[PDB]
Symmetry: C3
Subunit: 249 residues, 3 copies
């Protein structure tokens, strides 16, 4: 015969679709009657088409009644290929899946603003704020005075160490000075310090530089100092050169 | 009847596909005649198949003439399920979409070579170049002399503070020295400095250490110094011990 | 006629599917006979359906015998549209492809725990361990004594520079002291040092502060020192004020 406008028949329960090898179309009206059968592509009421092209080729299609999908298969040399199941718009939408073209760094959302760094070295120049403390090998200040304070350092003494000169301890302000003066016999001579004492002279002394006669007085005196001058007294009966020292601040 | 080699008919305009409930196949020759109708799966000329399996099941397929897609649906207990639309090769190609297997760090393109780091601490040991300046709590040099210069520090004085000894200010080079010497009556005695002055002796003095007789001269003298020796003159009429001091550089 | 339960015929080799413009269904039993033909959707044995809707519309479907896929096309005004090829479950599974919803940072696998950082500055406060060495502008210690050692620094001298006072070099321990004392004529007077020498007095001297008569002895003496006192001898025949200096440690 031919394919008719009426279906060839209704599939009852327990139909093995492998046995439907005659051309036509058949309706399965009941999902449960599909469940109780065999080789249904999906447990679902549906429409089956059979095209028995030849003994060696039996083609079948199945349209699920609820649009679950549409299936097809074929029997080639007494072996049924598996049912193919169509993909349709009720399964998935491609727009929901990431294109390879949308897979790159700047497109990836949720990226942290900052990243936990690995082991890196720095140059000192990238220290741009803060003052390194002593506990870290620093000097705990950004001033010279403050640095010394942190590490208990003093300042350099200064001096001019000439034949007549001075020496100054800048930690405390102490100045010490020296010079020579020719004195008249049994008399005074004034000296002028190489530099002035900023505040006052605290003391001095004088010393006979010559091979004075040991049978007579050769005393010395340091007195009447100012910030700039002092009086050296020579107790030797001849004119003589006396050296002196003086200190102050 | 049966499905014929000729189509059952041409669909004109204004056809509600819900009304095509008789088995057969019908052609819509004009996209616009689909537009003017109802329940077409797509506004597009196409081929419609109707399989009226039973009163309760009416199956339909629609093949768009331009291959837009292929559609199917069914009427179950007087309600039409929605049209299913097939996915085909003209819609998309899976090769353009990212597999889950190709979603990992090393595959992600456009990754920066370096990343903005978050708050991290360092150990000092990862400072491997540069010289920390004073403005940062550093000493602004990698030399001892250069460090002191930055912070205005002096160097330690050195000394040997024995009964006879010396003291040296290494900031300026000033050396001061002391000792004792037994002198003959009314005569000279030579002393040798604990260390030699590197350059010259700048001055000295001597002092009577004994309870000399106050009814006679007991003068002192320091003279004729070299880098290593000096002459101490004793103006007392007895042999006596005189202490001395001397300074230089 | 009508579509029959028997296929209209077997397609031999060398069939141009463009020529199959009569309604019916035909079977290609041999993949190689498809290879030797034209306009087959796939080189594969299969079932062909032709629906000659009208002169202007010829619809075709092709079901591959091995389920490779299912194809359809149409001839509109003497031009064949391309074959559409169905996507099915044997081609791909959507579950293997990444959803846009699963494309974010925390989902991306294989992320490194740490990231190579870019150029950043630090505040000194994020140095939280280690001691900066001199080679980096540090002081190579976390102690004051150790810092000075690294950079060769000395400590501050201390002093009290009053009319009678003292000065101490704390690098070496040397103390120097000064004062004045009224002495009886031709006699001794005891002095007490402004501070005690911690260990011993190493030396001293005295100096006549007055305009003594140059026709008589005005000698001086420093002797018998302890840590706290000394004896100043005045060789002048009048009572007189003598200044002194003393040093020790
Ligand atoms: Mg004499
Ligand atoms: Mg006398
Ligand atoms: Mg005299
Ligand atoms: Ni860092």
């Amino acid at each position: 015969g031919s394919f008719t406008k009426e279906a060839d028949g209704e599939l009852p329960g327990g139909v093995n679709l492998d046995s439907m090898v005659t051309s036509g179309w058949w309706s399965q009206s009941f999902t449960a009657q599909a469940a109780s059968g065999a080789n249904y592509p999906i447990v679902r009421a549906g429409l089956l088409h059979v095209y028995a092209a030849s003994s060696n080729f039996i083609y079948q299609t199945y349209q699920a009644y609820d649009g679950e999908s549409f299936y097809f298969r074929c029997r080639h040399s007494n072996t049924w290929f598996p049912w193919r199941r169509m993909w349709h718009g009720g399964d998935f939408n491609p727009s929901d899946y990431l294109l390879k073209s949308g897979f790159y760094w700047n497109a990836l959302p949720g990226k942290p603003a900052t990243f936990p760094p690995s082991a890196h070295n720095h140059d000192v120049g990238q220290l741009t704020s803060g003052i390194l403390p002593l506990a870290r090998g620093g000097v705990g200040s950004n001033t010279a005075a403050g640095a010394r304070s942190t590490i208990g350092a003093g300042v350099p003494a200064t001096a001019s160490l000439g034949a007549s000169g001075w020496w100054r301890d800048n930690d405390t302000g102490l100045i010490r000075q020296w010079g020579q003066v020719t004195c008249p016999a049994d008399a005074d001579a004034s000296i002028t310090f190489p530099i002035p004492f900023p505040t006052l002279c605290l003391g001095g002394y004088a010393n006979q530089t010559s091979a004075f006669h040991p049978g007579t007085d050769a005393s010395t005196g340091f007195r009447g100092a100012t910030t700039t001058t002092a009086v050296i007294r020579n107790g030797y009966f001849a004119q003589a050169v006396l050296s002196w020292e003086a200190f102050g601040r």
